[PDB]
């Protein structure tokens, strides 16, 4: 009554085949692999929902057709927010990034995306989920990235908050460090690297 | 028992007054509403425009997210705002709407300014403070389309079927718009509406 609907891991899973509804709608994008074109060029809308059921139809469908899909990044974001770092609710933000080389595509590139999908959609941060965006994916020969985008990077508390709940329902070991970059600093080239703002 | 309010209850609660002690002040809906808006951007598609904006299960988070709506307000030409209960899409095609149909409200271009506001306003009252007893069970949600040649408000309702659920909702809210009895209002099925067949659709009911 005025609550945030959170919805844990166990009870998302136990809806998976009255449709329960989301806090937010979130829309799926692809981008299409057409080298001859810009990103923004080859961005695609695939579809919106706001409740676990839709969630699962739709991720059950991609799960299954990705393979014939002309392209290798996924993306989920809050209505209204384009998975661009131009956005309005992005400019200002940045990403808690999990890189996986090589042998964790096999072994951990599907349970940790859909992980990230079910924090996101589950509303896992308490009130600090207000500050997320949106969850990207990008597939790639030399490895994977997978990121959950927020909207204000000098919100540390927030951030830190989102970053340390995000490493605990990967089941990351404390070892194995995780990054938080500004999106003004990912956009500038400098090297090899991207300073990390924050670390978990 | 259902959570019903009435008109002057519901204006009551509006515009600030007191503190929500205990997370316990506000006064709660039956149902948790959505708020919809369908965006004129022609360099977007119409699955990127329809938008779901807010959602509210209180009498006075309703007031507060109609408030700032009617602020920021363009009201342009081509856009849709719709009020639906959780979980439903403002789409026919969506499981709740496609068996069912619409009481249609059509307002002249003139109409904008004098009945627009006041209409809209009225239907989302029926709407929160479920107006229709039993039946409002059966009512989806309510839709505005604004456009030049003239604007659109509507109740939408889960089953066309349903004789005695339409007809006692169409009778209520007409008597809640204070329409005059001269003036008549028209249920029309989603499906009967889908299909293009010349000059007017098939009302199904009239009150
Ligand atoms: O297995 C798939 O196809 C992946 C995917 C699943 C579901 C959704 Cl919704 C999007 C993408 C796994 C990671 C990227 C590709
Ligand atoms: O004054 C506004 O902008 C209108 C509106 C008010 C409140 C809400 Cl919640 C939605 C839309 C009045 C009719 C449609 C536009």
């Given at each position: 009554?005025?609550?945030?609907?959170?919805?844990?891991?166990?009870?998302?899973?136990?809806?998976?085949?009255?449709?329960?509804?989301?806090?937010?709608?979130?829309?799926?994008?692809?981008?299409?692999?057409?080298?001859?074109?810009?990103?923004?060029?080859?961005?695609?809308?695939?579809?919106?929902?706001?409740?676990?059921?839709?969630?699962?139809?739709?991720?059950?469908?991609?799960?299954?057709?990705?393979?014939?899909?002309?392209?290798?990044?996924?993306?989920?974001?809050?209505?209204?927010?384009?998975?661009?770092?131009?956005?309005?609710?992005?400019?200002?933000?940045?990403?808690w990034?999990?890189?996986?080389?090589?042998?964790?595509?096999?072994?951990?590139?599907?349970?940790?995306?859909?992980?990230?999908?079910?924090?996101?959609?589950?509303?896992?941060?308490?009130?600090?989920?207000?500050?997320?965006?949106?969850?990207?994916?990008?597939?790639?020969?030399?490895?994977?990235?997978?990121?959950?985008?927020?909207?204000?990077?000098?919100?540390?508390?927030?951030?830190?908050?989102?970053?340390?709940?995000?490493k605990?329902?990967?089941?990351?070991?404390?070892?194995?460090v995780i990054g938080?970059?500004?999106?003004?600093?990912?956009?500038?080239?400098?090297?090899?690297?991207?300073?990390?703002?924050?670390?978990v």
């Amino acid at each position: 009554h005025g609550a945030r609907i959170i919805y844990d891991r166990a009870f998302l899973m136990a809806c998976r085949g009255g449709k329960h509804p989301l806090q937010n709608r979130w829309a799926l994008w692809f981008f299409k692999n057409d080298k001859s074109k810009t990103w923004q060029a080859n961005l695609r809308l695939i579809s919106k929902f706001d409740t676990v059921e839709d969630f699962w139809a739709l991720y059950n469908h991609i799960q299954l057709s990705s393979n014939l899909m002309p392209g290798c990044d996924y993306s989920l974001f809050k209505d209204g927010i384009e998975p661009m770092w131009e956005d309005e609710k992005n400019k200002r933000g940045g990403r808690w990034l999990i890189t996986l080389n090589k042998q964790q595509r096999r072994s951990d590139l599907n349970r940790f995306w859909l992980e990230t999908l079910l924090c996101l959609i589950g509303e896992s941060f308490d009130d600090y989920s207000d500050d997320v965006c949106g969850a990207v994916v990008n597939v790639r020969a030399k490895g994977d990235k997978i990121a959950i985008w927020t909207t204000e990077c000098e919100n540390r508390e927030a951030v830190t908050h989102i970053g340390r709940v995000y490493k605990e329902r990967l089941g990351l070991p404390p070892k194995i460090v995780i990054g938080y970059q500004s999106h003004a600093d990912t956009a500038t080239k400098s090297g090899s690297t991207t300073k990390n703002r924050f670390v978990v």
